[PDB]
Amino acid sequence: NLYFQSMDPTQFEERHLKFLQQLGKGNFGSVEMCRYDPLQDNTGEVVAVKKLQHSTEEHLRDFEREIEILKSLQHDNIVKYKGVCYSAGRRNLKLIMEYLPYGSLRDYLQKHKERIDHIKLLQYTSQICKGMEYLGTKRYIHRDLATRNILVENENRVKIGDFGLTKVLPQDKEYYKVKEPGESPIFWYAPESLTESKFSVASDVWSFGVVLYELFTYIEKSKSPPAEFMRMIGNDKQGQMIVFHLIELLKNNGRLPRPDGCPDEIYMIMTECWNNNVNQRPSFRDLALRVDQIRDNMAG
Ligand SMILES: Cc1cc(Nc2cc(CN3CCOCC3)c3nc(C)c(Cc4ccc(Cl)cc4F)n3n2)n[nH]1
Known part of the structure; x- marks a missing residue:
C-alpha cells in the first residue's frame, strides 16, 4: 500500500501519441496504429497500441497481467514490448508495442x-x-x-x-x-x-x-x-x-x-x-x- 508498484507514466504520454487508424478488433483486443512524436515535428515512430474492448475491472486486471508477461519477454521471435500509456489523464491503460507491417x-x-x-x-x-x-x-x-x-x-x-x-x-x-x-x-x-x-x-x-x-x-x-x-x-x-x-x-x-x-x-x-x-x-x-x-x- 505505502508504495505503489513501479510505472513509467512519462515514457509514452498520451498527448504525443497520434491516432492513425484502427488495425483490428479480435482476440488480440482492439489495436490501433499510432505515431509517437514527442518532438511534434512530424517525426517519431509508428507503434502499435493495444486497448481493451470492454474495460471491466476484471479485464483491466487481466490486461495488467498480460502487460507484465509481455514486459518480461525479450526474444527475436516475440513482438517487442515498448511500454504503457496511462491515457485519459492516467485513468486508463494502453499497451505500446512495435509495429510489424505485414500483420498476421x-x-x-x-x-x-x-x-x-x-x-x-x-x-x-x-x-x-x-x-x-x-x-x-x-x-x-x-x-x-x-x-x-x-x-x-x-x-x-x-x-x-x-x-x-x-x-x-x-x-x-x-x-x-x-x-x-x-x-x-x-x-x-x-x-x-x-x-x-x-x-x-x-x-x-x-x-x-x-x-x-x-x-x-x-x-x-x-x-x-x-x-x-x-x-x-x-x-x-x-x-x-x-x-x-x-x-x-x-x-x-x-x-x-x-x-x-x-x-x-x-x-x-x-x-x-x-x-x-x-x-x-x-x-x-x-x-x-x-x-x-x-x-x-x-x-x-
Ligand atoms: C501488436 C502489433 C500489431 C502489428 N501490426 C499489425 C498489422 C496488420 C496488417 N494491416 C496493416 C494495415 O493495413 C492492413 C493490414 C494487422 N492486421 C490486424 C488485424 C492486426 C492486429 C493484430 C493481429 C495479430 C496479432 Cl498477433 C496482434 C495484432 F495486434 N494487425 N496488426 N504490429 N504490432
Missing part, C-alpha cells in the same frame, strides 16, 4: 503467396518453435497459438504475439487448469484442454501442430482447421454438438489430413504433436532442432 501470418500467407515456398514455411516454423522454447523457460503457456496470432515483420522474420490468454504455470504443477473458461479456439485445442480445461507446454505443442498444418495448407481456403474439422463433423451441426463431435473425433484418432504437397516428414511432425498422450508429444526444443536439421540437410 494467416493473412500474410493468403496475401503474399508470390513470395512463399516450403523453405520460407520451414523458416517460420523454426522461428515459432524458438519463441515457444523461450516462453517455456518462463513457465508461460500461450494457450492461443495459431497463425492469426503470429505477426510478420518481413519475409524473413515472424514473431508471436497475442499474449492475451497466456498463463503462468503454478509453482508445483506442469499444467494450468483454467477455471473460468470463456471463448475457446476449439479447433486448435488439445483433447485434454477440451475435456479437462488443462493447459500445458504440451497443449501448446498440440496447437503448434495445427499451426504447422496451417502453414502447409496456405495454398487453399477450404482447408483451414475450422473448415476441415466441420467437414469431418458435418457442416450442418451447431452449438455444443460441434464440441461433442470434435472431442469424440480426436479421442479416437481423427486428425486433419495431410495438406496437398506437404512432405510426409512434415506431416509426421504434425502427427507427433497431435498425440493424445500428453507426455509423448515432442518438446519445442526437439521440434526446433528437427526442423533446422531438415532445413540444413537440403542440398546447398
Whole structure:
C-alpha cells in the first residue's frame, strides 16, 4: 500500500501519441496504429497500441497481467514490448508495442503467396518453435497459438504475439487448469484442454501442430482447421454438438489430413504433436532442432 508498484507514466504520454487508424478488433483486443512524436515535428515512430474492448475491472486486471508477461519477454521471435500509456489523464491503460507491417501470418500467407515456398514455411516454423522454447523457460503457456496470432515483420522474420490468454504455470504443477473458461479456439485445442480445461507446454505443442498444418495448407481456403474439422463433423451441426463431435473425433484418432504437397516428414511432425498422450508429444526444443536439421540437410 505505502508504495505503489513501479510505472513509467512519462515514457509514452498520451498527448504525443497520434491516432492513425484502427488495425483490428479480435482476440488480440482492439489495436490501433499510432505515431509517437514527442518532438511534434512530424517525426517519431509508428507503434502499435493495444486497448481493451470492454474495460471491466476484471479485464483491466487481466490486461495488467498480460502487460507484465509481455514486459518480461525479450526474444527475436516475440513482438517487442515498448511500454504503457496511462491515457485519459492516467485513468486508463494502453499497451505500446512495435509495429510489424505485414500483420498476421494467416493473412500474410493468403496475401503474399508470390513470395512463399516450403523453405520460407520451414523458416517460420523454426522461428515459432524458438519463441515457444523461450516462453517455456518462463513457465508461460500461450494457450492461443495459431497463425492469426503470429505477426510478420518481413519475409524473413515472424514473431508471436497475442499474449492475451497466456498463463503462468503454478509453482508445483506442469499444467494450468483454467477455471473460468470463456471463448475457446476449439479447433486448435488439445483433447485434454477440451475435456479437462488443462493447459500445458504440451497443449501448446498440440496447437503448434495445427499451426504447422496451417502453414502447409496456405495454398487453399477450404482447408483451414475450422473448415476441415466441420467437414469431418458435418457442416450442418451447431452449438455444443460441434464440441461433442470434435472431442469424440480426436479421442479416437481423427486428425486433419495431410495438406496437398506437404512432405510426409512434415506431416509426421504434425502427427507427433497431435498425440493424445500428453507426455509423448515432442518438446519445442526437439521440434526446433528437427526442423533446422531438415532445413540444413537440403542440398546447398
Ligand atoms: C501488436 C502489433 C500489431 C502489428 N501490426 C499489425 C498489422 C496488420 C496488417 N494491416 C496493416 C494495415 O493495413 C492492413 C493490414 C494487422 N492486421 C490486424 C488485424 C492486426 C492486429 C493484430 C493481429 C495479430 C496479432 Cl498477433 C496482434 C495484432 F495486434 N494487425 N496488426 N504490429 N504490432
